[PDB]
């Protein structure tokens, strides 16, 4: 029941590598990791991988721990309303034309954030526009997927398999192991 | 009297590598070229090594000559008053924090355009401020020394002599042989 220590010191067993090896063949993609918490998770995601050069555009009902984590980061973040993809798109181009604020440099990068299943609402979130508007754009995605995976789909796999969507236009998807598998941690 | 064409296809003789070398020894630069006429020099100058991309700040006083090769590139122009150093500080300050016309992107370059004697004003240029302001703002300097080679410093060499100021800051000088060497052509 005890583990040594960090993944990057002693803590990582076979286990580990099965079960990375198991989630990555699940999902569809090349490569996973797995942590003890989700929360925790997406608090240090963005951090790691982002800056304050680059711009953020969340949806308004996002969950609370992807705004912890890109507040922890540094980067300009602005939101749009719920469901609404006109909006994105003339917010998109705005703020491609407008640039860094003080500076009007060019953005460094944008990345575009929301979720599989808004779990307040019950609504889901429209992948192919999501899909079609970062490749004319040249943006990045990231997915949430803590309701979507397991429970939907003809065979459980999200929001890909709902809309037949490649899981491969989406950048960075993560998850939990909390809500439909009976465990703890997140991908 | 006959010249066979172009100095890249027939032109040149042993007298025109004789002729550059000497130049460029009494200037005090490492290197020069000759040509048959000065407007022609100025005319075709920026045009090889300039762009749209690119500001240039001329005096108010300056030549046609300048003018018209400045107008023939495409740079955005911008002049500056006779003889007042505070303006050209401030504009310099002004021009690199707004950036591009509609575009607001970092300038690519930026020259400093003057002449060494305004020959209807009778005035010299600032040559110690302009060197300290583009040294301090990157900036690129070039002198139109005209009326100014031949005729003035102690030994005749032209501002950089009258001045003091080593003829190494100064990026580009060129001069005509048609006011005080009794001749035609430019370097």
Not at 4 to 9: I, K, M, S, V, Y
Not at 33 to 54: E, I, R
Not at 154 to 169: A, Q, S, W
Request: net charge positive.
């Amino acid at each position: 029941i005890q583990s040594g220590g960090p993944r990057a010191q002693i803590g990582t067993t076979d286990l580990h590598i099965k079960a990375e090896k198991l989630v990555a063949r699940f999902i569809g993609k090349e490569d996973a990791l797995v942590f003890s918490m989700g929360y925790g998770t997406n608090a240090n995601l963005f951090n790691a991988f982002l800056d304050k050069k680059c711009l953020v555009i969340s949806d308004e009902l996002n969950h609370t721990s992807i705004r912890t984590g890109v507040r922890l980061s540094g980067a300009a973040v602005r939101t749009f309303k719920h469901g609404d993809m006109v909006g994105l798109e003339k917010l998109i181009r705005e703020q491609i034309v407008l640039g860094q604020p003080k500076t009007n440099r060019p953005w460094k990068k944008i990345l575009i954030c929301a979720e599989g299943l808004f779990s307040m609402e019950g609504t889901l979130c429209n992948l192919p526009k999501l899909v079609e508007l970062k490749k004319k754009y040249k943006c990045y995605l990231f997915i949430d997927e803590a309701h979507s995976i397991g429970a939907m789909g003809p065979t459980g796999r999200g929001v890909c398999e709902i809309f037949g969507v490649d899981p491969k236009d989406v950048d960075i998807l993560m998850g939990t192991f909390t809500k439909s598998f009976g465990a703890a941690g997140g991908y």
